[PDB]
Write an enzyme that holds these catalytic residues in place. Sequence first.
Site, PDB file in Angstrom:
ATOM      1  N   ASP C 101       0.761  -1.124  -0.154  1.00 16.10           N
ATOM      2  CA  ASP C 101       0.086  -0.016  -0.084  1.00 16.10           C
ATOM      3  C   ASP C 101       0.754   1.105  -0.112  1.00 16.10           C
ATOM      4  OD1 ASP C 101      -3.006   0.960   0.269  1.00 16.10           O
ATOM      5  OD2 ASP C 101      -2.117   1.948   1.853  1.00 16.10           O
ATOM      6  N   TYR C 150     -11.892   8.573  -2.621  1.00 18.96           N
ATOM      7  CA  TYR C 150     -11.544   8.735  -1.470  1.00 18.96           C
ATOM      8  C   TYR C 150     -10.083   9.486  -1.454  1.00 18.96           C
ATOM      9  CZ  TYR C 150      -7.597   5.179  -2.013  1.00 18.96           C
ATOM     10  OH  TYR C 150      -6.837   4.253  -2.405  1.00 18.96           O
ATOM     11  N   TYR C 232      -1.404  11.399   1.778  1.00 13.64           N
ATOM     12  CA  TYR C 232      -2.105  11.472   0.533  1.00 13.64           C
ATOM     13  C   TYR C 232      -1.999  13.019   0.351  1.00 13.64           C
ATOM     14  CZ  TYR C 232      -4.362   6.914   1.407  1.00 13.64           C
ATOM     15  OH  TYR C 232      -4.548   5.537   1.594  1.00 13.64           O
ATOM     16  N   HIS C 297      -7.481  -6.603  -0.420  1.00 19.63           N
ATOM     17  CA  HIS C 297      -6.486  -5.488  -0.424  1.00 19.63           C
ATOM     18  C   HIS C 297      -5.240  -5.916   0.305  1.00 19.63           C
ATOM     19  CE1 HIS C 297      -4.318  -1.747  -0.508  1.00 19.63           C
ATOM     20  NE2 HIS C 297      -4.522  -1.554   0.706  1.00 19.63           N
TER      21      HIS C 297
END
Lengths: 318, 318, 318
Positions: C101, C150, C232, C297
């Site tokens: 990730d 998201y 992010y 995931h």
Amino acid sequence: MEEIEHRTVEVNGIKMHVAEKGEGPVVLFLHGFPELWYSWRHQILALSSRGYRAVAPDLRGYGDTEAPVSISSYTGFHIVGDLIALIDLLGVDQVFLVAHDWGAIIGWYLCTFHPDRVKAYVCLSVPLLHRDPNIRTVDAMRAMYGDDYYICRFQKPGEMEAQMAEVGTEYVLKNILTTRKPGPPIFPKGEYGTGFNPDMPNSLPSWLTQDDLAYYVSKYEKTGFTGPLNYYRNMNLNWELTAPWSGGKIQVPVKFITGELDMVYTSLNMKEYIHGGGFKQDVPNLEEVIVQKNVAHFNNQEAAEEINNHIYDFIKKF
Amino acid sequence: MEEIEHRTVEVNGIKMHVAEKGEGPVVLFLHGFPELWYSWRHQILALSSRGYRAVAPDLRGYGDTEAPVSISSYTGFHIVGDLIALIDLLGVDQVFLVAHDWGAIIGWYLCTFHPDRVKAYVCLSVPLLHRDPNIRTVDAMRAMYGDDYYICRFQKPGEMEAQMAEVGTEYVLKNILTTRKPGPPIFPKGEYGTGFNPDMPNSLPSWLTQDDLAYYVSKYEKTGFTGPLNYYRNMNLNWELTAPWSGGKIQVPVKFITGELDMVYTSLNMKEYIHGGGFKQDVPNLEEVIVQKNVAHFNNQEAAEEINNHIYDFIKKF
Amino acid sequence: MEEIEHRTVEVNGIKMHVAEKGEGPVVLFLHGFPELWYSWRHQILALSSRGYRAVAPDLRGYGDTEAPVSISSYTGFHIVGDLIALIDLLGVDQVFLVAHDWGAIIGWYLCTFHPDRVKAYVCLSVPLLHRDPNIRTVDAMRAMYGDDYYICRFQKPGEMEAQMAEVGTEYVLKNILTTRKPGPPIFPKGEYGTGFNPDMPNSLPSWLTQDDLAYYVSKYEKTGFTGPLNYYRNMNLNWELTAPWSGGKIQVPVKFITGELDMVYTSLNMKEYIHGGGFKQDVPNLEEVIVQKNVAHFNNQEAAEEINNHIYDFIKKF
């Protein structure tokens, strides 16, 4: 597959669908729950090409075989009665027996009643149900796993049929066939779920195509589940009626094969019975126990080629 | 117990302690690590009273048997050499073989080199060591479990002796004999510590009396561990020297029996080998596998009566 | 779990919690969002066993690692700054690299800035973020999926935090961790709502235990989500600052592994990049792509053992 012959015969007062291919000594296949003759497709073609006559019926209450109306028509005695009549129709004295799940329980009964007519037996998933004189089959199951154990939940007439209809036939079949969860199937209260499989796969495993699945679905949409469920509803009656064979032994040569992850192998103290000496005690000519790594309940389909060889390698010794 | 005869014989250039009782066909018992003839005490008494001549030596490097100085004096060829010389002294052509742990590995070598000298073999704990032509015995163990796996740690000369010397002989024997922990034994870095057993009782189990432990301790206090440890130190050499027998089968009738909790049964993919078909392939007349519920490694001692009957019921067929 | 060492180290001007076990060549694990060092539990125990030194820190802003106050402290440069300082403290020149990730994104930066210090790379979930010189990372996402995607929703500081504070931290973690929904996570307009999982199971999947979920919940109840969300909030800035490496390639050996139901794999045209040549173009020593059927995931947790073998089999070659 198009080369497999299909016929209906009259046996023991019922009409039975019988799939067959090949010539030679009869190899008789008995499917389980919730399956059909079709579960044996790979074995039919395989043993067919080795000089044997492969014969796989739909059992009473299944697929294209007649489903008698009353639940009392589904004791092991009725079902062995069909098979004995079938073997007589095939015109042979002895058969090789290969059986799986409920078919294997029936197989055991056949060997109990008529060992003379079975040369040798490749038994999948389900070892001999040892008859404990102190407790009935389903009673022992309930005492161990309670009311939501699947076999207990299969007892009340109509109820599971109704629960299965809620989630639909295709879901029930996919849920069961794709399951790899070891241990006792315990259902959620008052409904199906998530029956046998809380982790249902996105795609079907390589051994089960969508066409394969469609075949089962088309047959079960026709028949429903009542016939098949009725076998379970007679387990305690079977226990009662088999009192004459209490403490007895089966002398038929046997090769036992289970998937390591099979819920049968992983519950009911089955390991202790299989490996502890009990199984060999009841079955003195049990030659070999094989546990298949990373194979689950439907081992003749999931491990088709290995099962083919295991069957041929054993039956050629006779 | 005091009716058991004890003598020293000269075999293969060493002096060997032999315990013996009874008359009849020889049943030859081979103890393992870290044991002695004494491990077979219940079997010696039980089988000698059933019309057999029970013979249990201390092997090379154990108990009251001579311990050669050189590590290279402990290959499987040295040890079978002793036993072949011994069977000759007994004046018999065949023995029944019963063995356990390291004794069982030696028993396999004996069945490999002279299957003619062995009528039938009751094998406890340790199945045949299948010779993988691509990888050495100890290398495969190191690859799977690392340097702290007990057999890996047993390799370096003097190291484990020293580590054992620090916790004391009695503690080592008690630690090992009382363990019920399944899976591979992994030692703590740089010391003996607790493994084989992180959960010592320390009240001895019923099958092992304080007198039993005392006898073991008095022998090992005398002999130390080097002799016994040296067996392991020759595993890679044994692998190399047995190249003439790779792909070989053993035709001797075998009955294999292990405790369910045995660390042998529960490591090194031994379950895959025992139950998957590998074992039966290598050993075509493997008649039966028995897995004893709630019994650990030292099954002949822990389940003595069980084992006595298991031996008797097997060898009486020959 | 208790044999796992936990220390705090000073790297790049922040205090970093590091979890460590075993010895040998270093294997460095980088967790993603919203995870912890704890995501790597199975891999740590597995690989420290086979003679590697498994090292897995909490990244900056996570768990027990310091969480700098400013958003600007969360560029890829700050975090690779942390990791290089760490590998130095570890005193090796190279490490093996495993990441998942957001950890995998950081790992890509590491391979970009210092391929010399990475022997080989096991990359889970997130392939290399290809630098399109024509459009910034989040801009492309927003063009493709709109404002409620998201990642776009994570941009405005304080907003996702507050939406997560309503609804609570346990819900967020369970909602995210249990998701098996493929494709772009698209949030309901003005709140968290169902975000990630419109069909949350009542029961945790078998791979996640209540102790597992409680561990995550515990740290995240202490730390909150700011630190992790800040990664992010620097994706566009990372895009700008990586202008020097526009058009570059990456020569580190890479094994890429994804669950077929991962939202990453099933959005943003990841499939065409991975299989279409683009990923191989950017990463010439990409040895193979492994798509794990019926896995979502968090593949290092859902297919833990399988991935243990995948890592091991890869870093064996080096």
